[PDB]
């Protein structure tokens, strides 16, 4: 593909560097940041926080993040462009659809959703000219008809553009298998797909079977381990009860099984969030003060201590995301 679209324009593959492939500047809902910025203190305060957060990730080695905030998660690409410029960190914007499609979206056909995704990749997002460089989709539990529709639209937009697909799953129901079956029915190469939130499960058989088929495995919620918060049923029912080390050890397990080229690692962090309880951002920041720097500051050294060679870690953090993000109709 030779070049990747970012919120500051196209960049060469060689410029991508250390990449976090599943992040958010702000997790919200369509139109919300514009309608009630004071929910986040102010837009200015959100930008300031995000710029500090990205600058800290940059100092820990990160050069690119993939912001997988979709339309229905309130993606504001102008926000992304501003914080990318100030922090000097590449940001890849997303199209696709998460779990909260509005009535307008829920009424659309597979053809119409394909056109929408293609618009955001080929023409630009809103009136900004910023083009999406990834397609993000989400399913939960048992595949609904609309979920299937979004997955087929995602596959078709990927096939038309070479841009990869990244998914939200909820590993407990092995949602990746359902997603894979739909993607393959559309003729999509598994090498264009990252099955994400895969660190939510300890089922290594499930993960290795997907990697064997050629899928990228997104181990992308490593710091979302709320092991001291049982009094907080909200944090418990959204973060879980396994430690971050246990999650991180899945990375090593997959490396040990021979699948280092299939692994993508990230934090799934953000600097503001409105789509859960008020001040849930404070709860998250309390559990993981490192923010997006958690992967480079904590997880990479942890894997290095466990015997993972430097070259393998560089492969996972630099080579795999570059190969994944580079638009490809092959192979």
- Site for ligand CAC, rule CB under 6 A: 27, 73, 168, 268
Alpha carbons 143 and 179: distance in angstroms, whole number: 8
147 labeled binding residue: no
- SS3 for 151? helix
Judge whether 162 and 327 are in contact, CB under 8 Å.
yes
Judge whether 204 and 173 are in contact, CB under 8 Å.
no
Task: Give which of a second copy, ligand CAC, Zn ion, none residue 71 binds (C-beta under 5 to 8 Å, depending on kind).
Answer: a second copy
Task: Give which of ligand CAC, a second copy, Zn ion, none residue 74 binds (C-beta under 5 to 8 Å, depending on kind).
Answer: a second copy
**Which spans of this chain sit near a second copy (rule: CB under 8 A)?**
28-32, 34-36, 38, 71-72, 74, 99-100, 102-105, 107-109, 112, 116, 119-120, 125-127, 274-278
Alpha carbons 72 and 69: distance in angstroms, whole number: 8
What b/e string do you get for 132-165 counting C-beta neighbours within 10 Å, with b at 16 or more?
bbbbbbbbeeebeebbbbbbbbbbbbbbebebbb
Nearest distance, CB of residue 117 and ligand CAC, angstroms: 18
Nearest distance, CB of residue 111 and a second copy, angstroms: 10
Alpha carbons 194 and 136: distance in angstroms, whole number: 10
Task: Give which of ligand CAC, Zn ion, a second copy, none residue 28 binds (C-beta under 5 to 8 Å, depending on kind).
Answer: a second copy
Nearest distance, CB of residue 22 and Zn ion, angstroms: 6
CA atoms in the 13 A half-sphere facing the CB of 35: 7
In the complex, residue closest to Zn ion by CB: 168
**Which spans of this chain sit near Zn ion (rule: CB under 5 A)?**
168, 268
Let me know the angle formed at the C-alpha of 155 by 17 and 67, rounded to the nearest 5 degrees: 35
Kindly report whether the peptide bond that precedes residue 331 is cis, defined as omega within 30 degrees of 0. Answer: yes
Nearest distance, CB of residue 270 and Zn ion, angstroms: 8
Nearest distance, CB of residue 323 and a second copy, angstroms: 30
Binding-site entries: 22, 24, 136, 168, 197, 268
Binding-site entries for Zn(2+): 22, 24, 136, 168, 197, 268
């Amino acid at each position: 593909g030779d070049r990747i679209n970012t919120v500051r324009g196209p960049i060469a593959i060689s410029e991508v560097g250390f990449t976090l492939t599943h992040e958010h500047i702000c997790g919200s809902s369509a139109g919300f940041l514009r309608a009630w910025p004071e929910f986040f203190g102010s837009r200015e305060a959100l930008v300031e926080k995000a710029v500090r957060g990205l600058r800290r990730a940059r100092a820990a080695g990160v050069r690119t993040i993939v912001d997988v905030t979709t339309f229905d998660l309130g993606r504001d690409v102008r926000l992304l462009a501003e914080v990318s410029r100030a922090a000097d960190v590449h940001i890849v914007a997303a199209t696709g659809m998460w779990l909260d499609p509005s009535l307008t979206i829920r009424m659309r056909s597979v053809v119409e959703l394909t056109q929408f995704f293609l618009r955001e990749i080929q023409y630009g997002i809103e009136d900004t000219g910023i083009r999406a460089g990834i397609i993000k989709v989400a399913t939960t539990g048992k595949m609904t008809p609309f979920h299937e529709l979004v997955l087929r639209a995602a596959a078709r937009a990927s096939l038309a553009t070479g841009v990869p697909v990244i998914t939200h799953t909820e590993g407990s129901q092995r949602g990746g298998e359902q997603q894979a079956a739909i993607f393959e029915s559309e003729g999509l190469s598994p090498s264009r797909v990252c099955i994400g939130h895969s660190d939510e499960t300890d089922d290594l058989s499930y993960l290795t079977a997907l990697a064997a088929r050629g899928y990228l495995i997104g181990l992308d919620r490593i710091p979302h381990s709320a092991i001291g918060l049982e009094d907080n049923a909200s944090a418990t029912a959204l973060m879980g009860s396994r430690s971050w080390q246990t999650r991180a050890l899945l990375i090593k397990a997959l490396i040990d099984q021979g699948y280092k080229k299939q692994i993508l690692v990230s934090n799934d962090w953000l600097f503001g969030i409105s789509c859960y309880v008020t001040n849930f951002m404070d709860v998250m920041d309390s559990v993981n003060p490192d923010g997006m720097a958690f992967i480079p500051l904590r997880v990479i050294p942890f894997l290095r201590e466990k015997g993972t060679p430097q070259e393998t870690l560089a492969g996972i953090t630099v080579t795999n995301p570059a190969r994944f993000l580079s638009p490809t109709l092959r192979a």
